[PDB]
Subunit: 100 residues, 2 copies
């Protein structure tokens, strides 16, 4: 896996933020990060849809220097406190966010 | 406010991780971060209670230097995709997490 500083990864998610909000007509979205067990890491977005918080994220691996590497081309959707996987693109994840 | 580098803030939350897990008999907990709008930033924990993801967090202000400062002594509990605040300590927040 190719590792990059955390800031570089965050910036990539930030660059897609506005385009994603415009495309899906979202009013309030922010960057989401979670530090998992055993140097596992999750990065994505949290959408505030009328007081409901919906989070979508991708899996990363964190090395000794804190750098991050994308683990798999898969998005997970966290809604109502439960997670659903199997989404292979942001568009697919958003389809679940908007239409489920 | 008292600003400190993000790394310093994260490490302080990490220091309380194991003690909190032992005190409440939690099996899987990690650090949670969310970049809000404007100068808003949120830091806390996400607990995996039998597949249910429950997040608790505190409000921070991020200055132009990327540093973080605690904005208010209050915890917010995000369960089932919705948030509830008014908790003034981690103990109070956990009571909402556990006793619910």
């Amino acid at each position: 896996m190719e590792f990059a500083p955390r800031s570089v990864v965050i910036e990539e998610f930030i660059d897609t933020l506005e385009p994603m909000m415009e495309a899906y007509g979202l009013d309030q979205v922010g960057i989401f990060e979670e530090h998992g067990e055993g140097n596992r890491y999750y990065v994505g977005y949290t959408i505030n849809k009328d007081d409901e918080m919906i989070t979508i994220h991708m899996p990363f691996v964190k090395n000794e220097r804190g750098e991050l590497a994308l683990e798999k081309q898969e998005w997970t959707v966290r809604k109502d406190g439960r997670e659903k996987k199997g989404f292979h693109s942001l568009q697919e994840a958003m389809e679940e966010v908007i239409h489920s």
